[PDB]
């Protein structure tokens, strides 16, 4: 039976998903000490979270009722549940995040028998370091830092899928952009001419991107350093 592995690491995808499904359906420990920005939800106006239930199962009710599309995942709760999964999340965020999402969407669909306009998305938080203490070992790992916002840019459109049209017979094809790259068609399957297509930019699909500039806090620093 063919099986999928993360390249060079021997992590298999599905065995993580089993444990994360258990975490979502079962964790209820920390709810005596719920935090200030996390203790309210809503169907309309505002409502208060109940202690006694599995916590993320309770938080999914907001996604059903108020149609919120994201979950804030406190990583301290996951570390309390299982360090063996917490280490994988921090070490490989670019590989495991596309599947813990799917576990959340599966549990939502099973619980409520319902679909939504966009997928429910994860946001892990509360993993702390300094901007100078980063090393080449930390590339593609999960980190958290703090500072003050000085400037924000205007929005940039970032394409996800282009749209080609044949110049000779007005046939049209979609083409996904992935790994930063698009693939251009060469032969028109309708009229059988070659090197024939032209990209139509405004028939294609884009996403939002923004740049934000962040500044060091001056408090922690050693002698003589500027922020």
């Amino acid at each position: 039976q063919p099986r999928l592995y993360v390249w060079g690491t021997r992590i298999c995808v599905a065995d993580v998903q089993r444990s994360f499904r258990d975490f979502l359906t079962t964790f209820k420990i920390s709810q005596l000490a719920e935090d200030e920005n996390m203790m309210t939800g809503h169907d309309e106006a505002l409502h208060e979270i109940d202690v006694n239930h599995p916590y993320y199962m309770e938080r999914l009710l907001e996604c059903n009722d108020a149609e919120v599309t994201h979950i804030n995942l406190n990583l301290k709760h996951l570390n309390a549940f299982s360090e063996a999964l917490y280490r994988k999340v921090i070490a490989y965020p670019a590989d495991v995040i596309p599947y813990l999402d799917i576990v959340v969407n599966e549990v939502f669909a099973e619980r409520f028998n319902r679909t939504l306009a966009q997928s429910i998305e994860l946001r892990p938080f509360n993993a702390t370091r300094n901007m100078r203490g980063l090393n080449p070992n930390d590339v593609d790992q999960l980190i958290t830092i703090s500072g003050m916002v000085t400037r924000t840019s205007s929005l940039i459109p970032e394409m996800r899928s282009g749209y080609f049209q044949c110049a000779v017979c007005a046939f049209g094809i979609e083409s996904e952009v992935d790994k930063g790259r698009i693939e251009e068609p060469v032969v028109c399957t309708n009229c059988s001419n070659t090197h024939c297509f032209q990209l139509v930019h405004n028939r294609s699909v884009f996403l939002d991107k923004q740049v934000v500039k962040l500044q060091e806090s001056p408090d922690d620093m050693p002698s003589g350093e500027t922020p």
Partner: protein, 632 residues
């Protein structure tokens, strides 16, 4: 006329590592420290070896001189041979065991070598930068290799060179590519590309023979789990003042730093550097590739001369006498400088911070050795800056906005009080500074910050510095007919920020003049102080060591001292009301008392403040007060 038999050279190098030794200090045996460091690399407690070429030169081994000369003359090649011999030594130590996996590249290599399993194949498939994962650096101490920035010319390309200088500019650490790894789409093969220099060009088409013959047109995609990165940093280093020719300005040079030698320097440090001089890939640009760096600001170990003092105790009088022994007298002034070199404790009760360090202002008549004392303090302190009143702007003291003409960007540039952070700033000719330049230090002397809001910049900088200042009275001499406020022409807001204010007179007297003349003429005869009483005095190096030891303590105040301190403050504040020639007194005074008491407890190396230290602080403040009314 060239030698390329690498196996014989490897044999010589391995014989050096096997046979260098140092005798044990108890005489129990011999240490073989280089192979101990090799075994530390083998068990992965280490990342680099620093080799001293002079040890190779003075080893008791055949062809040792020839090996040292070959290393020095073609250092860029001999690094590879040293890495190869250390790799062979590591495998001989390790045997059939495996080194531990610690990072993702180690995990990838250990997994992939046994995927390949499931020496010719290993060496053909993998480049040696990827197979070997440690660093090798060289050093020299002999004066044959000492040069300036100015002297490094065309004869020095490819050679090992050593020098000494000051750091102007330094970048932050960045990831630098060493080996790229690519994988093919269709045929799942891998390409390894080592990178040399500051550029590389990625290959496009797959080279594997089956893919090429099938014409499968598989693209190559780069992967950063298999690729190798290394810490990189860039510096600019300037000539030291003694190295410059007569009537000339110092020159500068660019330095590239890799790996474990990064983050050893910041701006405002003096360094000793060993490295290799190279071009950039018919007229060429050049740089220096650093091999070893040493801070001369910095350099559980204790010297025997310090051990004698630490066993002796009662060191306060000797420590006071040891500050600038060429200068006769001024024992209490030297004690005040000794307290300013140490300082008190920082306090942060309930969010409110209080400054811990001590500020001293010296004044006096001309020719009474103020500049000599400031120069000795600047040599004695670890991190310190020296400025004059005329040569400095209020932007050169604090921080500046710099407009880069190449890019158009704005940036900040830290001044003297920023560079001296954690240390001492000496300000000479303090009375001749302009008022609008002088008023910049008001925030630094009490809040220890600099805050800026200009152009497109808004920040705060830390400036945790003590200030020692020297001046003349208001018309060049003390006038006994005018008041204290007329003699000391400073505003009260600035005057309250100094913990101690002193006056040093010069008055003619037929015995003291002869005694001073005897002392100065002896110094001019012999080049050293008289020491007619044959008492002990402390060297500058071990005095620096002792002050560095004193800074580690944080003695706590006894709550029994409360009534003595508070009653002293009230009694001090009575006189400023009921005097004919008063001075300004404010609530900062009692904090000054607490600072000086904790400073003398630090000098004693005790952990609890004594009433003796409180009394000595009161005695010094009384002396400082009495200095400002001579012959009254």
């Amino acid at each position: 006329t060239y030698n390329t038999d690498w196996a014989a050279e490897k044999t010589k190098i391995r014989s050096f590592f096997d046979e260098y030794y140092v005798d044990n200090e108890d005489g129990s045996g011999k240490a073989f420290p280089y192979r101990d460091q090799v075994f530390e690399i083998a068990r992965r407690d280490k990342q680099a070896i620093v080799v001293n070429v002079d040890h190779i030169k003075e080893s008791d081994i055949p062809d040792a001189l020839e090996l040292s000369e070959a290393i020095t003359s073609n250092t860029k090649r001999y690094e590879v041979l040293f890495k190869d011999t250390i790799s062979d030594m590591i495998q001989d130590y390790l045997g059939d065991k495996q080194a531990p996996v610690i990072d993702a590249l180690d995990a990838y290599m250990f997994q992939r070598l046994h995927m390949d399993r499931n020496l010719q194949d290993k060496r053909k498939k993998y480049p040696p930068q990827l197979l070997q994962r440690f660093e090798v650096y060289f050093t020299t101490d002999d004066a044959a290799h000492e040069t300036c920035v100015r002297n490094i010319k065309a004869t020095e390309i490819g050679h090992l060179v050593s020098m000494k200088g000051v750091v102007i500019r330094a970048t932050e650490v960045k990831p630098c590519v060493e080996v790229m790894t690519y994988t093919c789409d269709t045929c799942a093969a891998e390409v390894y590309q080592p990178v040399k220099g500051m550029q590389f060009t990625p290959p496009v088409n797959c080279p594997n023979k089956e893919c090429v013959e099938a014409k499968a047109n598989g693209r190559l995609h780069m992967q950063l789990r298999g690729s190798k990165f290394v810490k990189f940093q860039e510096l600019k280093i300037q000539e030291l003042s003694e190295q410059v020719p007569v009537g000339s300005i110092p020159r500068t040079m660019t330095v590239h730093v890799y790996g474990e030698m990064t983050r050893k320097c910041n701006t405002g440090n003096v360094v000793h550097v060993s490295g290799v001089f190279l071009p950039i890939m018919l007229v060429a640009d050049t740089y220096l590739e650093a091999h070893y760096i040493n801070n001369l600001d910095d350099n559980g170990v204790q010297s025997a001369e310090l051990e004698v003092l630490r066993r002796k105790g009662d060191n306060y009088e000797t420590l006071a006498a040891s500050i600038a022994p060429e200068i006769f007298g001024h024992v209490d002034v030297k004690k005040c400088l000794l307290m300013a070199l140490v300082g008190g404790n920082d306090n942060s009760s309930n969010g409110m911070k209080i400054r811990g360090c001590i500020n001293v202002l010296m004044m006096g008549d001309p020719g009474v050795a103020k500049s000599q004392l400031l120069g000795y303090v600047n040599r004695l302190a670890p991190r310190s800056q020296y400025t004059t009143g005329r040569g400095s702007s209020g932007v050169g003291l604090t921080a500046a906005v710099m407009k880069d003409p190449v890019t158009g960007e704005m940036s900040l540039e830290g001044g003297a009080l920023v560079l001296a952070d954690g240390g001492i700033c000496c300000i000479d000719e303090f009375d001749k500074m302009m008022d609008h330049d002088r008023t910049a230090i008001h925030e630094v002397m009490e809040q220890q910050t600099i805050s800026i809001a200009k152009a497109g910049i808004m920040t705060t900088l830390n400036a945790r510095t003590a200030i020692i200042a020297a001046a003349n009275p208001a018309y060049g001499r003390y006038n006994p007919n005018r008041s204290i406020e007329q003699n000391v022409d400073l505003p009260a807001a600035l005057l309250s920020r100094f913990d101690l204010i002193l006056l040093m007179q010069d008055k003619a007297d037929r015995e003291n003049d002869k005694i001073l003349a005897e002392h100065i003429t002896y110094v001019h005869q012999h080049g050293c102080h008289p020491n007619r009483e044959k008492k002990d005095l402390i060297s500058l190096e071990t005095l620096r060591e002792y002050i560095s030891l004193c800074k580690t303590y944080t003695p706590t105040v006894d709550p029994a001292l409360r009534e003595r301190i508070v009653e002293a403050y009230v009694e001090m504040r009575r006189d400023a009301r009921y005097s004919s020639d008063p001075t300004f007194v404010s609530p900062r005074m009692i904090l000054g008392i607490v600072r000086m008491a904790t400073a003398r407890a630090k000098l004693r190396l005790s952990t609890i403040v004594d009433e003796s230290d409180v009394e000595e602080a009161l005695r010094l403040m009384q002396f400082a007060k009495d200095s400002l009314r001579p012959e009254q």
